[PDB]
Homo-oligomer: A and B are copies of this chain.
Amino acid sequence: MNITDIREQFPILHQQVNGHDLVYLDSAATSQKPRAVIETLDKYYNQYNSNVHRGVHTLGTRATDGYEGAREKVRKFINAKSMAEIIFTKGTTTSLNMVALSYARANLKPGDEVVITYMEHHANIIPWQQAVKATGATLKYIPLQEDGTISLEDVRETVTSNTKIVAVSHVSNVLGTVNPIKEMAKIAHDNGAVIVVDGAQSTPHMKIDVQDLDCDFFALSSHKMCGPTGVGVLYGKKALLENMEPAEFGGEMIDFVGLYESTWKELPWKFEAGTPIIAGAIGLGAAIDFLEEIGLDEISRHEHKLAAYALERFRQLDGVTVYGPEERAGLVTFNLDDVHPHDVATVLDAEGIAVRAGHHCAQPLMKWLDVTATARASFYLYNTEEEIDKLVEALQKTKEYFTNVFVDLEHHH
């Protein structure tokens, strides 16, 4: 895996911000795209765009083969058994809402539980809050250990035979924790529950095998894995999708439409109402071809290296706290002792460095961490150790800068 050659493929990395080379360390907010993906969208709109399915003309057939071809690339990429289990959506958030609408609201009754965890992103909290309110069921939280991991004993304790759904992040977008999904799916199933896995932050960065995980549903976003924005996937075991009703209705997802009643198409098209995200899904297929050619295991190994290097270099800084476990995905969320993380992010952008500040859509987690906000540097296959040196040098300079503003503000007062 050669990082110079990989970087050459991402035009956006080769520019300056505020007079400094860009150092983009915000791929957990979104990833950048290689020329293979952007040129795939260009070739689609330059050469073969047309609406898909019922192909009667040559560009229609080409577009259709492109769109359904990308469906097959996705199925192979996550090791699903069938294309019928691969639904294109506009993103992880929509995929999780479809499960909460079409599965949870159809299957929960008073006394049923949905169990989630304190580290979940909002997209894997609010749909359940709403679905339990709608059905009179109960929402429960699995507690965290003090390093921000989950113990399977806590899982066993929290999940009961009234639990119908466990929903849990594969990888935390804040802590970098990789959760024990395969063993949690066993506990869910032993209790008569399904497990819903939020794979938004795992799928770009590590190999996903839904047969090995034995997850009932798995949601992911293209924009985080070198693909176009506005596109996602919901995977669900075929036997569960077959018994779920559509979450929206329209053209393309019907078989017969009468004045008052309609019947639906087979899977996966039952869940794809209206003209689909044709260019975006084909560009997500090109992203997958791109990542597979590099190797997901090579990408994970590179990120392990960057994360171990980052945590070590963060520990060399005084006055900095890093949240979450030592063993982790390719991101670091942190605070400088005396500086608001928004000011940290603002100053780092003056040195060309892009990180994020805020709650990262995990308010209950920030509460658990006893903070109101954090800063986050997150990595991907185009980032390097030198970029991490630049970050840790700028955090040092940031600390000195703010301690000097303060020291000299109180020689004023």
Query: Which A residues are closer than 8 A to B by beta carbons?
Result: 11-12, 15, 17-18, 22, 24, 26, 29-30, 32-33, 37-38, 41-42, 45-51, 54, 56-60, 90-94, 96-97, 100, 121-123, 125-127, 129-130, 139, 141, 221, 223, 228-231, 248-252, 254, 256-262, 273-280, 342, 345-346, 348-349, 353-358, 361, 363-364
Contact = CB atoms under 8 A, between A and B. Distances in A.
27 contacts: A11-B46, A12-B47, A15-B47, A30-B51, A32-B45, A32-B49, A33-B45, A38-B46, A45-B228, A54-B356, A54-B358, A56-B358, A93-B273, A93-B274, A122-B250, A123-B250, A125-B262, A126-B250, A126-B257, A126-B262, A129-B249, A221-B274, A229-B280, A230-B230, A230-B276, A230-B278, A280-B280
Nearest 3 A/B pairs, CB to CB: A93-B274, A251-B361, A230-B277
B230 A279 contact: yes
Stoichiometry, copies per complex: 2
A218 B278 CA distance: 23
A59 B231 CA distance: 21
A228 B278 CA distance: 9
A357 B55 CA distance: 9
Nearest to A251: B361
B349 A254 contact: no
A184 to B, nearest CB: 20
Contact of A29 (B12, B46, B51, B363): B51
A26 B57 contact: yes
Nearest to A53: B358
A260 B97 contact: no
A121 to B, nearest CB: 6
B363 A249 contact: no
A119 B261 CA distance: 16
B279 A248 contact: no
Contact of A349 (B45, B56, B127, B276): B56
Nearest to A34: B45
A121 B251 contact: yes
Given A41-B42, A126-B249, A254-B363, 6 more contacts: A29-B50, A29-B60, A56-B345, A60-B354, A125-B262, A251-B361
Contacts of A363: 254, 256-258
Contacts of A256: 363
A277 to B, nearest CB: 3
Contacts of A94: 248, 273-274
A51 B251 CA distance: 31
A45 B91 CA distance: 18
A47 to B, nearest CB: 6
B92 A274 contact: yes
A33 B357 CA distance: 37
B30 A50 contact: yes
Contact of A257 (B122, B354, B355): B122
A391 to B, nearest CB: 13
A256 to B, nearest CB: 7
B229 A278 contact: yes
Contact of A354 (B59, B231, B254): B59
Nearest to A361: B251
Contacts of A12: 45-49, 59
A91 B251 CA distance: 12
Contacts of A56: 342, 345-346, 349, 355-358
Nearest to A224: B275
